[PDB]
């Protein structure tokens, strides 16, 4: 079968730069039959340019695409906010058809600091034998951020599990949860809860804390 | 407007059946290259089947012999019956008209997650993430729901039946069942007036939960 590898496999850009995704075909493709699709989380995939260089309806001018043989390239000749997704190539010269592995866009933007929130766990919730923390950091840039959680001063470890949201289509930040789970016996023995942050936006770590029963 | 419409989808048994389907609007399937396609979780997309005008099928090696591509020319619909599915199955399904014998493909349907697993269904338990000091800041405030245990994916969050708003991926829980926060992001000075209800929809447990968001000092 025709191997198709994409490079790069990641790609970071500011909005209004060029980007260049490559595909290479480890045998020459026939005709220049050659598509690109562009796939947002969560979404199917959207044709963006078939038969190497042809834009399919509807598509943004600022997509393109070009080569022959062996080599094809996907332009963004000028990055929007909204680009950030996946992208596939796929040849259809020789059967089977296959698709490359995909190169991610990630938007680059300023450096934005989360403002970070918590959350008790509900009374309804405890009810059950079990309390979940929640902490939220919210709109900020970049993606890496560590995340600690402190009861009663003492580091946890083993008992947070996090999530991150896709980029923010228009201002490219994330947001990130963080949720603590313990038991309701352990949530009870215990008076301060804290999440403490850092990231690259903030000066100094921020802590962000309540104490059991407010 | 040149569409496909899929239906089916859901939780399956390892070694059952699951049929998908698509309704196709503005092209006939009768007369086009169609085909399946999936992307299990994280990974790439890998054809499935084809199926051509004068009829002829074709396979990949991991489901030939045990997935049919079909057609009903006179409902303008094209089907997928898999069997004997197994876990390395699971993956979101779409269905697609081909431009080329070999792909090209201009028109997707929106896709469904086809789940393999021996688990039982479990509905959502849904709980408030009450707006506080602690979530506010200045002007706005978060509130949200915590939707937490529940098998398989996905469930769907609305809020008020839109702004502001960021539902997490779930995560895996070491229990084998999911978990996701939804918060919004609302004006400070709503949260004594305003009431905020989370409406949680999780299909494969036919669970409807509104769940009312208060806050707490």
């Known amino acids: 079968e025709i191997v198709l590898t994409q490079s790069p496999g990641t790609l970071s850009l500011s909005p209004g730069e060029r980007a260049t995704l490559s595909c290479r075909a480890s045998?020459?493709?026939?005709?220049?039959?050659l598509a690109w699709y562009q796939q947002k989380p969560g979404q199917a995939p959207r044709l963006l340019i078939y038969?190497?260089?042809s834009r399919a309806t509807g598509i943004p001018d600022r997509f393109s695409g070009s080569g022959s043989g062996t080599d094809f390239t996907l332009t963004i000749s000028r990055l929007e906010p909204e680009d950030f997704a996946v992208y596939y190539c796929q040849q259809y010269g020789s059967s089977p058809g296959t698709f490359g592995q995909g190169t991610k866009v990630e938007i680059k933007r300023t450096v934005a600091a989360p403002s970070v929130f918590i959350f008790p766990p509900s009374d309804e919730q405890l009810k059950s034998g079990t309390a979940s923390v929640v902490c939220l950091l919210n709109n900020f840039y970049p993606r890496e951020a560590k995340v600690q959680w402190k009861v009663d001063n003492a580091l946890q470890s083993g008992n947070s599990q996090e999530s991150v949201t896709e980029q923010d289509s228009k201002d490219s930040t994330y947001s990130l949860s963080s949720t603590l789970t313990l038991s309701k016996a352990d949530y009870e023995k215990h008076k301060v809860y804290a999440c403490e942050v850092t990231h690259q936006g903030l000066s100094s770590p921020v802590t962000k804390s309540f104490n059991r029963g407010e | 407007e040149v569409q496909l419409v899929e239906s089916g989808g859901g939780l399956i048994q390892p070694g059952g059946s699951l049929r998908l389907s698509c309704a196709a609007s503005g092209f006939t399937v009768s007369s086009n290259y169609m085909s399946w396609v999936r992307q299990a979780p994280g990974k790439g997309l890998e054809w499935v089947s084809v199926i051509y005008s004068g009829g002829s099928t074709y396979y990949a090696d991991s489901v030939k012999g045990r997935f049919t591509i079909s057609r009903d020319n006179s409902k303008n619909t094209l089907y997928l019956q898999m069997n004997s599915l197994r876990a390395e199955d699971t993956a979101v399904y779409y269905c697609?008209?081909?431009?080329?014998?070999?792909?090209?493909?201009?028109?997707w349907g929106q896709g469904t997650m086809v789940t393999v697993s021996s688990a039982s269904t479990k509905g959502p338990s849904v709980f408030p993430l009450a707006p506080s000091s602690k979530s506010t800041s200045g002007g706005t405030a978060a509130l949200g729901c915590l939707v937490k245990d529940y098998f398989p994916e996905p469930v769907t969050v609305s809020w008020n039946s839109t702004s502001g708003v960021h539902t997490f991926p779930a995560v895996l829980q070491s229990s084998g069942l999911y978990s996701l926060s939804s918060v919004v992001t609302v004006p400070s000075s709503s949260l004594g007036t305003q009431t905020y209800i989370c409406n949680v929809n999780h299909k494969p447990s036919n669970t409807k939960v509104d769940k009312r968001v208060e806050p707490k000092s």
């Open positions: 045998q020459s493709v026939s005709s220049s039959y």
């Open positions: 697609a008209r081909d431009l080329y014998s070999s792909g090209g493909t201009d028109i």
């Open positions: 038969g190497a260089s």
